[PDB]
Design a protein around this ligand. Structure first.
Ligand code: NA
Ligand code: NA
Lengths: 134, 154, 154, 135
Protein backbone atom coordinates (compact mmCIF):
# COMPACT_ATOMS: atom_id res chain seq x y z
CA UNK A 1 0.00 0.00 0.00
CA UNK A 2 1.42 3.45 -1.00
CA UNK A 3 -0.31 6.87 -0.69
CA UNK A 4 -0.13 10.65 -1.22
CA UNK A 5 -2.09 13.66 0.08
CA UNK A 6 -1.53 17.29 -1.03
CA UNK A 7 -2.80 20.86 -0.52
CA UNK A 8 -2.00 23.12 -3.52
CA UNK A 9 -1.57 26.93 -3.92
CA UNK A 10 -5.29 27.27 -4.97
CA UNK A 11 -6.26 25.49 -1.68
CA UNK A 12 -7.42 22.13 -3.20
CA UNK A 13 -6.99 18.91 -1.14
CA UNK A 14 -6.52 15.56 -2.94
CA UNK A 15 -5.66 11.97 -1.79
CA UNK A 16 -4.49 8.93 -3.82
CA UNK A 17 -3.81 5.30 -2.72
CA UNK A 18 -2.45 2.19 -4.54
CA UNK A 19 -1.53 -1.41 -3.47
CA UNK A 20 -0.67 -4.96 -4.61
CA UNK A 21 -2.69 -6.12 -1.54
CA UNK A 22 -1.22 -8.64 1.00
CA UNK A 23 1.20 -11.54 0.26
CA UNK A 24 -0.79 -14.87 -0.09
CA UNK A 25 -4.24 -13.10 -0.07
CA UNK A 26 -7.38 -14.80 -1.45
CA UNK A 27 -7.77 -13.72 -5.11
CA UNK A 28 -10.81 -11.40 -5.73
CA UNK A 29 -10.69 -10.20 -2.04
CA UNK A 30 -10.83 -6.36 -1.61
CA UNK A 31 -9.08 -4.39 1.17
CA UNK A 32 -9.23 -0.68 2.18
CA UNK A 33 -7.50 0.77 -0.93
CA UNK A 34 -10.34 1.06 -3.53
CA UNK A 35 -13.06 2.00 -0.95
CA UNK A 36 -13.74 5.77 -0.60
CA UNK A 37 -13.76 6.61 3.13
CA UNK A 38 -11.67 3.55 4.11
CA UNK A 39 -8.40 3.75 2.06
CA UNK A 40 -8.79 7.29 0.82
CA UNK A 41 -10.83 10.56 1.33
CA UNK A 42 -10.49 14.25 0.35
CA UNK A 43 -12.79 17.27 1.04
CA UNK A 44 -11.60 20.93 0.44
CA UNK A 45 -13.82 21.77 3.53
CA UNK A 46 -11.93 19.36 5.94
CA UNK A 47 -9.04 17.00 5.15
CA UNK A 48 -7.31 14.71 2.57
CA UNK A 49 -6.45 11.26 4.08
CA UNK A 50 -4.62 8.13 2.71
CA UNK A 51 -4.51 5.03 4.99
CA UNK A 52 -2.38 1.89 5.27
CA UNK A 53 -3.02 -1.14 7.51
CA UNK A 54 -5.36 -4.04 8.19
CA UNK A 55 -8.03 -3.48 5.45
CA UNK A 56 -10.93 -5.24 7.21
CA UNK A 57 -10.47 -2.84 10.20
CA UNK A 58 -9.92 0.38 8.09
CA UNK A 59 -13.14 -0.56 6.14
CA UNK A 60 -15.31 -1.38 9.24
CA UNK A 61 -14.07 1.83 11.04
CA UNK A 62 -14.24 3.98 7.78
CA UNK A 63 -10.82 5.43 8.87
CA UNK A 64 -10.24 8.01 6.01
CA UNK A 65 -13.77 9.52 6.33
CA UNK A 66 -13.69 9.16 10.14
CA UNK A 67 -10.74 11.67 10.36
CA UNK A 68 -12.89 14.17 8.37
CA UNK A 69 -16.05 13.33 10.40
CA UNK A 70 -14.24 13.83 13.81
CA UNK A 71 -12.81 17.24 12.70
CA UNK A 72 -15.95 18.59 10.94
CA UNK A 73 -18.65 17.09 13.28
CA UNK A 74 -16.63 16.54 16.50
CA UNK A 75 -14.67 19.85 16.27
CA UNK A 76 -11.41 17.80 16.73
CA UNK A 77 -8.07 19.22 15.43
CA UNK A 78 -6.21 17.19 12.70
CA UNK A 79 -3.72 15.86 15.37
CA UNK A 80 -6.65 15.02 17.77
CA UNK A 81 -8.71 13.22 15.04
CA UNK A 82 -5.47 11.29 14.10
CA UNK A 83 -4.86 10.27 17.80
CA UNK A 84 -8.51 9.10 18.29
CA UNK A 85 -8.44 7.00 15.07
CA UNK A 86 -4.87 5.57 14.84
CA UNK A 87 -3.79 5.24 18.53
CA UNK A 88 -7.25 4.38 20.11
CA UNK A 89 -10.16 3.27 17.83
CA UNK A 90 -8.21 0.95 15.42
CA UNK A 91 -6.10 -0.90 18.08
CA UNK A 92 -9.46 -1.55 19.92
CA UNK A 93 -10.80 -3.22 16.68
CA UNK A 94 -7.51 -5.21 16.65
CA UNK A 95 -6.22 -3.18 13.65
CA UNK A 96 -2.59 -2.17 12.97
CA UNK A 97 -1.32 0.55 10.58
CA UNK A 98 -1.33 4.31 10.00
CA UNK A 99 -2.37 7.11 7.65
CA UNK A 100 -1.20 10.46 6.23
CA UNK A 101 -3.53 13.49 6.31
CA UNK A 102 -3.49 17.21 5.35
CA UNK A 103 -6.35 19.60 6.46
CA UNK A 104 -7.61 22.77 4.63
CA UNK A 105 -5.27 24.91 6.89
CA UNK A 106 -2.09 23.03 5.72
CA UNK A 107 -1.56 21.03 8.94
CA UNK A 108 0.13 17.61 8.21
CA UNK A 109 -0.10 14.39 10.33
CA UNK A 110 1.54 10.90 9.72
CA UNK A 111 0.24 8.76 12.63
CA UNK A 112 0.92 4.97 12.81
CA UNK A 113 0.54 2.33 15.61
CA UNK A 114 2.93 -0.07 13.78
CA UNK A 115 6.74 -0.53 14.20
CA UNK A 116 7.34 1.54 11.00
CA UNK A 117 5.63 3.60 8.29
CA UNK A 118 7.66 4.51 5.18
CA UNK A 119 6.75 8.19 4.96
CA UNK A 120 7.87 11.65 3.76
CA UNK A 121 6.42 15.20 3.77
CA UNK A 122 7.41 18.84 3.18
CA UNK A 123 5.99 22.33 2.40
CA UNK A 124 6.58 23.78 -1.14
CA UNK A 125 10.10 25.39 -1.37
CA UNK A 126 11.24 23.65 1.91
CA UNK A 127 13.29 20.41 2.24
CA UNK A 128 11.36 17.24 3.10
CA UNK A 129 11.44 15.22 6.36
CA UNK A 130 11.50 11.41 5.73
CA UNK A 131 11.04 8.60 8.29
CA UNK A 132 10.74 4.80 8.76
CA UNK A 133 10.66 4.08 12.59
CA UNK A 134 9.04 5.88 15.64
CA UNK B 1 1.12 24.24 0.11
CA UNK B 2 2.34 20.77 1.20
CA UNK B 3 2.66 17.04 0.25
CA UNK B 4 2.81 13.86 2.43
CA UNK B 5 3.39 10.32 0.97
CA UNK B 6 3.54 6.78 2.45
CA UNK B 7 4.96 3.50 1.09
CA UNK B 8 3.22 1.34 3.71
CA UNK B 9 2.96 0.76 7.52
CA UNK B 10 3.74 -2.48 9.49
CA UNK B 11 6.42 -4.62 11.26
CA UNK B 12 9.48 -2.98 9.51
CA UNK B 13 12.08 -4.46 11.94
CA UNK B 14 15.43 -2.60 12.37
CA UNK B 15 17.04 -5.92 13.55
CA UNK B 16 16.54 -7.52 10.04
CA UNK B 17 17.50 -4.27 8.17
CA UNK B 18 20.92 -2.66 7.39
CA UNK B 19 21.53 1.15 7.20
CA UNK B 20 22.13 0.87 3.40
CA UNK B 21 18.65 -0.78 3.05
CA UNK B 22 17.16 2.07 5.18
CA UNK B 23 18.90 4.67 2.92
CA UNK B 24 17.44 3.03 -0.29
CA UNK B 25 13.86 3.58 1.15
CA UNK B 26 14.79 7.08 2.47
CA UNK B 27 16.21 8.23 -0.94
CA UNK B 28 13.20 6.84 -2.93
CA UNK B 29 10.78 8.63 -0.49
CA UNK B 30 12.87 11.88 -0.47
CA UNK B 31 13.04 11.86 -4.32
CA UNK B 32 9.26 11.33 -4.73
CA UNK B 33 8.12 13.85 -2.05
CA UNK B 34 10.63 16.32 -3.69
CA UNK B 35 9.01 15.81 -7.18
CA UNK B 36 5.66 16.57 -5.48
CA UNK B 37 7.04 19.67 -3.66
CA UNK B 38 8.47 21.03 -6.99
CA UNK B 39 5.11 20.45 -8.80
CA UNK B 40 3.24 22.21 -5.92
CA UNK B 41 5.71 25.18 -6.16
CA UNK B 42 5.28 25.27 -10.03
CA UNK B 43 1.49 25.67 -9.44
CA UNK B 44 0.35 22.05 -10.24
CA UNK B 45 -3.01 20.90 -8.69
CA UNK B 46 -3.21 18.67 -5.54
CA UNK B 47 -4.73 15.97 -7.82
CA UNK B 48 -1.93 15.92 -10.46
CA UNK B 49 0.52 15.96 -7.47
CA UNK B 50 -1.06 12.94 -5.60
CA UNK B 51 -1.50 11.14 -8.97
CA UNK B 52 2.23 11.62 -9.87
CA UNK B 53 3.54 10.69 -6.35
CA UNK B 54 1.45 7.44 -6.27
CA UNK B 55 2.51 6.64 -9.89
CA UNK B 56 6.18 7.04 -8.82
CA UNK B 57 5.48 4.84 -5.70
CA UNK B 58 3.99 2.33 -8.20
CA UNK B 59 7.07 2.42 -10.56
CA UNK B 60 9.44 1.99 -7.54
CA UNK B 61 10.04 -1.74 -6.89
CA UNK B 62 10.65 -0.98 -3.14
CA UNK B 63 6.89 -0.40 -2.55
CA UNK B 64 3.81 -2.72 -2.58
CA UNK B 65 2.03 -1.11 -5.58
CA UNK B 66 2.57 -1.31 -9.37
CA UNK B 67 6.13 -2.78 -9.91
CA UNK B 68 6.99 -4.75 -6.74
CA UNK B 69 3.33 -5.72 -6.01
CA UNK B 70 2.89 -8.63 -3.53
CA UNK B 71 1.65 -12.00 -4.93
CA UNK B 72 -1.77 -13.63 -4.28
CA UNK B 73 -2.16 -17.31 -3.10
CA UNK B 74 -2.32 -18.26 -6.85
CA UNK B 75 1.01 -16.40 -7.56
CA UNK B 76 -0.88 -13.66 -9.50
CA UNK B 77 -0.96 -9.88 -8.83
CA UNK B 78 -4.25 -8.00 -8.07
CA UNK B 79 -3.79 -4.21 -7.78
CA UNK B 80 -6.20 -1.63 -6.35
CA UNK B 81 -6.02 2.18 -6.45
CA UNK B 82 -8.21 5.13 -5.45
CA UNK B 83 -8.08 8.92 -5.98
CA UNK B 84 -10.32 11.64 -4.48
CA UNK B 85 -10.63 15.30 -5.59
CA UNK B 86 -11.35 17.52 -2.52
CA UNK B 87 -12.70 20.30 -4.81
CA UNK B 88 -15.51 18.35 -6.60
CA UNK B 89 -15.58 15.43 -4.09
CA UNK B 90 -15.32 13.12 -7.16
CA UNK B 91 -13.41 9.86 -6.59
CA UNK B 92 -12.33 6.99 -8.80
CA UNK B 93 -11.20 3.46 -7.87
CA UNK B 94 -10.00 0.27 -9.60
CA UNK B 95 -9.96 -3.06 -7.64
CA UNK B 96 -8.32 -6.34 -8.77
CA UNK B 97 -6.64 -5.17 -12.04
CA UNK B 98 -3.57 -7.09 -13.39
CA UNK B 99 -3.07 -5.68 -17.00
CA UNK B 100 -2.62 -1.95 -16.06
CA UNK B 101 0.97 -0.76 -15.30
CA UNK B 102 -0.36 2.23 -13.23
CA UNK B 103 -3.65 1.50 -11.46
CA UNK B 104 -3.75 5.06 -9.93
CA UNK B 105 -3.91 6.44 -13.55
CA UNK B 106 -6.86 4.03 -14.28
CA UNK B 107 -8.59 5.23 -11.05
CA UNK B 108 -8.17 8.86 -12.19
CA UNK B 109 -9.69 7.80 -15.56
CA UNK B 110 -12.71 6.22 -13.76
CA UNK B 111 -13.07 9.47 -11.72
CA UNK B 112 -12.88 11.77 -14.81
CA UNK B 113 -14.37 9.87 -17.78
CA UNK B 114 -17.07 7.71 -16.02
CA UNK B 115 -20.25 8.47 -13.95
CA UNK B 116 -19.06 5.72 -11.50
CA UNK B 117 -16.64 5.67 -8.54
CA UNK B 118 -15.40 2.11 -8.84
CA UNK B 119 -14.76 -0.51 -11.62
CA UNK B 120 -13.37 -4.05 -11.02
CA UNK B 121 -11.24 -6.58 -12.97
CA UNK B 122 -11.83 -6.94 -16.73
CA UNK B 123 -14.45 -4.10 -16.81
CA UNK B 124 -11.96 -1.65 -15.20
CA UNK B 125 -9.26 -2.80 -17.66
CA UNK B 126 -11.61 -2.69 -20.71
CA UNK B 127 -12.73 0.85 -19.66
CA UNK B 128 -9.02 1.96 -19.67
CA UNK B 129 -8.03 0.14 -22.93
CA UNK B 130 -10.98 1.88 -24.78
CA UNK B 131 -9.42 5.24 -23.62
CA UNK B 132 -5.86 4.39 -24.82
CA UNK B 133 -4.18 2.91 -21.63
CA UNK B 134 -1.60 0.20 -22.51
CA UNK B 135 -2.26 -3.52 -21.84
CA UNK B 136 0.73 -5.06 -19.91
CA UNK B 137 1.33 -8.65 -18.67
CA UNK B 138 0.98 -9.09 -14.87
CA UNK B 139 4.61 -10.50 -15.05
CA UNK B 140 6.03 -6.90 -15.19
CA UNK B 141 5.16 -6.35 -11.42
CA UNK B 142 6.95 -9.58 -10.30
CA UNK B 143 10.07 -9.33 -8.04
CA UNK B 144 12.07 -12.17 -6.44
CA UNK B 145 11.78 -10.23 -3.09
CA UNK B 146 7.95 -10.46 -3.06
CA UNK B 147 8.10 -14.03 -4.57
CA UNK B 148 10.44 -15.26 -1.72
CA UNK B 149 8.10 -13.58 0.87
CA UNK B 150 5.17 -15.62 -0.59
CA UNK B 151 7.14 -18.94 -0.23
CA UNK B 152 7.89 -17.90 3.42
CA UNK B 153 4.19 -17.21 4.11
CA UNK B 154 3.55 -20.79 2.76
CA UNK C 1 -37.63 -4.35 18.93
CA UNK C 2 -38.25 -3.00 15.39
CA UNK C 3 -37.54 -3.76 11.68
CA UNK C 4 -37.55 -1.42 8.63
CA UNK C 5 -37.30 -2.69 4.99
CA UNK C 6 -37.18 -0.93 1.56
CA UNK C 7 -37.69 -2.26 -2.00
CA UNK C 8 -35.92 0.69 -3.68
CA UNK C 9 -36.32 4.53 -3.88
CA UNK C 10 -37.01 6.02 -7.40
CA UNK C 11 -39.45 7.43 -10.00
CA UNK C 12 -42.74 5.73 -8.86
CA UNK C 13 -45.57 7.73 -10.60
CA UNK C 14 -49.14 7.15 -9.22
CA UNK C 15 -50.53 8.23 -12.66
CA UNK C 16 -48.88 5.17 -14.40
CA UNK C 17 -50.01 2.63 -11.69
CA UNK C 18 -53.46 1.12 -10.73
CA UNK C 19 -54.56 0.23 -7.10
CA UNK C 20 -54.23 -3.58 -7.57
CA UNK C 21 -50.67 -3.06 -9.01
CA UNK C 22 -49.87 -0.92 -5.90
CA UNK C 23 -51.48 -3.54 -3.61
CA UNK C 24 -49.19 -6.35 -4.98
CA UNK C 25 -46.17 -4.22 -3.73
CA UNK C 26 -47.97 -3.40 -0.40
CA UNK C 27 -48.77 -7.12 0.31
CA UNK C 28 -45.17 -8.28 -0.55
CA UNK C 29 -43.78 -5.53 1.81
CA UNK C 30 -46.36 -6.28 4.55
CA UNK C 31 -45.65 -10.05 4.35
CA UNK C 32 -41.84 -9.57 4.61
CA UNK C 33 -41.87 -6.95 7.40
CA UNK C 34 -44.38 -9.23 9.27
CA UNK C 35 -41.99 -12.27 9.23
CA UNK C 36 -39.24 -9.90 10.54
CA UNK C 37 -41.53 -8.52 13.29
CA UNK C 38 -42.49 -12.11 14.39
CA UNK C 39 -38.77 -13.19 14.50
CA UNK C 40 -37.90 -10.08 16.57
CA UNK C 41 -40.85 -10.80 18.92
CA UNK C 42 -39.71 -14.50 19.23
CA UNK C 43 -36.25 -13.21 20.40
CA UNK C 44 -34.24 -13.71 17.13
CA UNK C 45 -31.15 -11.37 16.60
CA UNK C 46 -31.03 -8.15 14.45
CA UNK C 47 -28.66 -9.97 12.09
CA UNK C 48 -30.75 -13.11 11.47
CA UNK C 49 -33.80 -10.83 11.07
CA UNK C 50 -32.19 -8.44 8.45
CA UNK C 51 -30.69 -11.50 6.66
CA UNK C 52 -34.16 -13.19 6.37
CA UNK C 53 -35.97 -9.96 5.31
CA UNK C 54 -33.30 -9.20 2.60
CA UNK C 55 -33.44 -12.87 1.50
CA UNK C 56 -37.23 -12.62 1.08
CA UNK C 57 -36.77 -9.23 -0.78
CA UNK C 58 -34.31 -11.19 -3.00
CA UNK C 59 -36.77 -14.14 -3.63
CA UNK C 60 -39.55 -11.59 -4.46
CA UNK C 61 -39.48 -10.90 -8.22
CA UNK C 62 -41.07 -7.42 -7.62
CA UNK C 63 -37.75 -6.05 -6.30
CA UNK C 64 -34.36 -5.27 -7.92
CA UNK C 65 -32.45 -7.88 -5.85
CA UNK C 66 -31.94 -11.66 -6.30
CA UNK C 67 -34.89 -12.98 -8.44
CA UNK C 68 -36.04 -9.95 -10.53
CA UNK C 69 -32.52 -8.42 -10.77
CA UNK C 70 -32.19 -5.70 -13.51
CA UNK C 71 -30.00 -6.54 -16.57
CA UNK C 72 -26.60 -4.91 -17.46
CA UNK C 73 -25.84 -3.49 -21.00
CA UNK C 74 -24.55 -7.05 -21.86
CA UNK C 75 -27.99 -8.52 -20.84
CA UNK C 76 -26.25 -10.20 -17.85
CA UNK C 77 -27.07 -9.94 -14.10
CA UNK C 78 -24.53 -8.63 -11.57
CA UNK C 79 -25.77 -8.79 -7.93
CA UNK C 80 -24.19 -7.08 -4.86
CA UNK C 81 -25.03 -7.44 -1.14
CA UNK C 82 -23.71 -6.31 2.28
CA UNK C 83 -24.50 -7.24 5.93
CA UNK C 84 -23.19 -5.39 8.99
CA UNK C 85 -23.45 -6.56 12.60
CA UNK C 86 -23.90 -3.65 15.11
CA UNK C 87 -22.71 -5.97 17.95
CA UNK C 88 -19.31 -7.09 16.52
CA UNK C 89 -19.02 -4.26 13.93
CA UNK C 90 -18.11 -7.04 11.39
CA UNK C 91 -19.38 -6.67 7.82
CA UNK C 92 -19.41 -8.86 4.74
CA UNK C 93 -20.03 -7.86 1.11
CA UNK C 94 -20.22 -9.59 -2.29
CA UNK C 95 -20.06 -7.44 -5.50
CA UNK C 96 -20.70 -8.54 -9.11
CA UNK C 97 -21.79 -12.18 -8.46
CA UNK C 98 -24.06 -14.03 -10.97
CA UNK C 99 -24.11 -17.76 -9.84
CA UNK C 100 -25.41 -17.13 -6.22
CA UNK C 101 -29.26 -17.18 -5.82
CA UNK C 102 -29.10 -15.14 -2.52
CA UNK C 103 -26.17 -12.70 -2.45
CA UNK C 104 -27.05 -11.49 1.12
CA UNK C 105 -26.34 -15.13 2.29
CA UNK C 106 -22.92 -15.01 0.52
CA UNK C 107 -22.19 -11.62 2.20
CA UNK C 108 -23.02 -13.25 5.60
CA UNK C 109 -20.59 -16.08 4.68
CA UNK C 110 -17.81 -13.51 3.85
CA UNK C 111 -18.61 -11.77 7.20
CA UNK C 112 -18.40 -14.97 9.31
CA UNK C 113 -15.99 -17.34 7.48
CA UNK C 114 -13.42 -14.89 5.98
CA UNK C 115 -10.89 -12.31 7.34
CA UNK C 116 -12.08 -10.02 4.46
CA UNK C 117 -14.98 -7.56 4.23
CA UNK C 118 -15.51 -7.88 0.48
CA UNK C 119 -15.10 -10.50 -2.35
CA UNK C 120 -15.89 -9.91 -6.10
CA UNK C 121 -16.97 -12.00 -9.14
CA UNK C 122 -15.71 -15.58 -9.48
CA UNK C 123 -13.63 -15.41 -6.24
CA UNK C 124 -16.77 -14.45 -4.23
CA UNK C 125 -18.61 -17.36 -5.94
CA UNK C 126 -15.75 -19.89 -5.44
CA UNK C 127 -15.51 -18.85 -1.75
CA UNK C 128 -19.27 -19.58 -1.28
CA UNK C 129 -19.29 -22.89 -3.29
CA UNK C 130 -16.37 -24.20 -1.10
CA UNK C 131 -18.62 -23.45 1.97
CA UNK C 132 -21.65 -25.36 0.56
CA UNK C 133 -23.66 -22.63 -1.27
CA UNK C 134 -25.42 -23.85 -4.44
CA UNK C 135 -24.29 -22.80 -7.96
CA UNK C 136 -27.27 -21.42 -9.98
CA UNK C 137 -27.57 -20.14 -13.58
CA UNK C 138 -27.87 -16.32 -13.94
CA UNK C 139 -31.09 -17.23 -15.96
CA UNK C 140 -33.05 -17.73 -12.67
CA UNK C 141 -33.07 -13.92 -11.88
CA UNK C 142 -34.47 -12.99 -15.34
CA UNK C 143 -38.06 -11.58 -15.61
CA UNK C 144 -39.86 -10.17 -18.70
CA UNK C 145 -40.59 -6.95 -16.66
CA UNK C 146 -36.86 -6.21 -16.13
CA UNK C 147 -36.03 -7.50 -19.69
CA UNK C 148 -38.58 -5.07 -21.29
CA UNK C 149 -37.21 -2.19 -19.09
CA UNK C 150 -33.70 -2.91 -20.49
CA UNK C 151 -35.04 -2.78 -24.12
CA UNK C 152 -36.76 0.55 -23.13
CA UNK C 153 -33.65 2.18 -21.64
CA UNK C 154 -31.65 0.64 -24.52
CA UNK D 1 -31.84 -2.29 -4.32
CA UNK D 2 -33.60 -3.78 -1.24
CA UNK D 3 -32.65 -3.28 2.43
CA UNK D 4 -33.40 -4.21 6.03
CA UNK D 5 -32.50 -2.64 9.37
CA UNK D 6 -33.51 -4.12 12.74
CA UNK D 7 -33.16 -3.61 16.52
CA UNK D 8 -33.66 -6.80 18.58
CA UNK D 9 -34.78 -7.51 22.18
CA UNK D 10 -31.08 -7.65 23.36
CA UNK D 11 -30.51 -4.16 21.80
CA UNK D 12 -28.42 -5.32 18.75
CA UNK D 13 -28.61 -3.26 15.51
CA UNK D 14 -27.93 -4.80 12.06
CA UNK D 15 -28.30 -3.70 8.39
CA UNK D 16 -28.30 -5.69 5.12
CA UNK D 17 -28.54 -4.53 1.50
CA UNK D 18 -28.87 -6.39 -1.87
CA UNK D 19 -29.33 -5.25 -5.53
CA UNK D 20 -29.27 -6.13 -9.24
CA UNK D 21 -27.67 -2.64 -9.76
CA UNK D 22 -28.84 -0.18 -12.51
CA UNK D 23 -30.69 -1.29 -15.71
CA UNK D 24 -28.21 -0.98 -18.72
CA UNK D 25 -25.16 -0.41 -16.39
CA UNK D 26 -21.54 -0.96 -17.52
CA UNK D 27 -20.59 -4.52 -16.44
CA UNK D 28 -18.15 -4.67 -13.45
CA UNK D 29 -19.22 -1.12 -12.30
CA UNK D 30 -19.73 -0.85 -8.49
CA UNK D 31 -22.53 1.03 -6.71
CA UNK D 32 -23.24 1.81 -3.04
CA UNK D 33 -24.60 -1.68 -2.11
CA UNK D 34 -21.39 -3.68 -1.35
CA UNK D 35 -19.43 -0.65 0.03
CA UNK D 36 -19.53 -0.44 3.84
CA UNK D 37 -20.65 3.04 4.96
CA UNK D 38 -22.20 3.89 1.55
CA UNK D 39 -24.99 1.27 1.07
CA UNK D 40 -24.99 -0.16 4.57
CA UNK D 41 -23.79 0.50 8.21
CA UNK D 42 -24.67 -0.77 11.72
CA UNK D 43 -23.17 0.08 15.16
CA UNK D 44 -24.91 -0.89 18.47
CA UNK D 45 -23.63 2.52 19.85
CA UNK D 46 -25.50 4.62 17.17
CA UNK D 47 -27.62 3.44 14.22
CA UNK D 48 -28.26 0.74 11.55
CA UNK D 49 -28.73 2.27 8.05
CA UNK D 50 -29.56 0.80 4.57
CA UNK D 51 -29.46 3.20 1.59
CA UNK D 52 -30.91 3.24 -1.92
CA UNK D 53 -30.11 5.75 -4.70
CA UNK D 54 -27.45 7.23 -6.95
CA UNK D 55 -24.50 4.93 -5.98
CA UNK D 56 -21.76 7.34 -7.14
CA UNK D 57 -23.19 10.05 -4.77
CA UNK D 58 -24.00 7.69 -1.77
CA UNK D 59 -20.34 6.49 -2.02
CA UNK D 60 -18.73 9.98 -2.19
CA UNK D 61 -20.96 11.21 0.71
CA UNK D 62 -20.57 7.88 2.72
CA UNK D 63 -24.35 8.16 3.35
CA UNK D 64 -24.86 5.15 5.72
CA UNK D 65 -21.82 6.02 7.91
CA UNK D 66 -22.56 9.79 7.64
CA UNK D 67 -25.94 9.25 9.47
CA UNK D 68 -23.97 7.49 12.30
CA UNK D 69 -21.21 10.17 12.34
CA UNK D 70 -23.75 13.11 12.50
CA UNK D 71 -25.62 11.47 15.45
CA UNK D 72 -22.44 10.28 17.30
CA UNK D 73 -20.14 13.33 16.69
CA UNK D 74 -22.65 16.07 15.73
CA UNK D 75 -25.12 15.04 18.51
CA UNK D 76 -27.94 15.11 15.87
CA UNK D 77 -31.17 13.11 16.43
CA UNK D 78 -31.89 10.24 13.95
CA UNK D 79 -34.59 12.40 12.23
CA UNK D 80 -32.11 15.38 12.05
CA UNK D 81 -29.20 13.28 10.66
CA UNK D 82 -31.70 11.80 8.09
CA UNK D 83 -32.83 15.34 6.97
CA UNK D 84 -29.20 16.66 6.63
CA UNK D 85 -28.12 13.64 4.53
CA UNK D 86 -31.22 12.78 2.39
CA UNK D 87 -32.92 16.24 1.88
CA UNK D 88 -29.75 18.48 1.82
CA UNK D 89 -26.27 16.91 1.28
CA UNK D 90 -27.20 14.34 -1.42
CA UNK D 91 -29.44 16.60 -3.62
CA UNK D 92 -26.53 19.17 -3.54
CA UNK D 93 -24.20 16.41 -4.96
CA UNK D 94 -26.97 15.69 -7.53
CA UNK D 95 -27.98 12.42 -5.75
CA UNK D 96 -31.56 11.05 -5.63
CA UNK D 97 -32.88 8.24 -3.35
CA UNK D 98 -33.42 7.44 0.36
CA UNK D 99 -32.49 5.19 3.29
CA UNK D 100 -34.02 3.28 6.23
CA UNK D 101 -32.38 3.74 9.66
CA UNK D 102 -33.00 2.56 13.27
CA UNK D 103 -30.99 4.04 16.20
CA UNK D 104 -30.04 2.30 19.52
CA UNK D 105 -33.20 3.93 21.13
CA UNK D 106 -35.63 2.28 18.63
CA UNK D 107 -36.42 5.49 16.65
CA UNK D 108 -37.13 4.62 12.92
CA UNK D 109 -36.66 6.88 9.84
CA UNK D 110 -37.50 6.21 6.11
CA UNK D 111 -36.33 9.45 4.40
CA UNK D 112 -36.28 9.72 0.56
CA UNK D 113 -36.02 12.77 -1.79
CA UNK D 114 -37.58 10.70 -4.65
CA UNK D 115 -41.24 10.43 -5.84
CA UNK D 116 -41.44 7.00 -4.06
CA UNK D 117 -39.64 4.51 -1.79
CA UNK D 118 -41.20 1.02 -1.43
CA UNK D 119 -40.95 0.75 2.34
CA UNK D 120 -42.38 -0.84 5.50
CA UNK D 121 -41.65 -0.95 9.24
CA UNK D 122 -43.28 -2.20 12.46
CA UNK D 123 -42.37 -2.89 16.12
CA UNK D 124 -42.27 -6.53 17.42
CA UNK D 125 -45.86 -7.73 18.21
CA UNK D 126 -47.36 -4.66 16.44
CA UNK D 127 -49.08 -3.92 13.09
CA UNK D 128 -46.71 -2.69 10.33
CA UNK D 129 -46.99 0.58 8.31
CA UNK D 130 -46.28 0.22 4.53
CA UNK D 131 -45.81 3.09 2.01
CA UNK D 132 -44.87 3.81 -1.67
CA UNK D 133 -45.50 7.59 -2.28
CA UNK D 134 -44.17 10.64 -0.27
CA UNK D 135 -45.20 11.17 3.43
NA1 NA E 1 6.22 -0.16 -6.37
NA1 NA F 1 -36.14 -9.88 -5.93
Amino acid sequence: TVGAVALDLDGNLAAATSTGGMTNKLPCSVGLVPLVGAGCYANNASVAVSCTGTGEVFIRALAAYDIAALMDYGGLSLAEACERVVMEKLPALGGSGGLIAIDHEGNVALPFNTEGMYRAWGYAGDTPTTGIYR
Amino acid sequence: AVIAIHGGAGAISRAQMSLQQELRYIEALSAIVETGQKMLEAGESALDVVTEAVRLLEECPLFNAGIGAVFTRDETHELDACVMDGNTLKAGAVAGVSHLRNPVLAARLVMEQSPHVMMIGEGAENFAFARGMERVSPEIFSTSLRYEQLLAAR
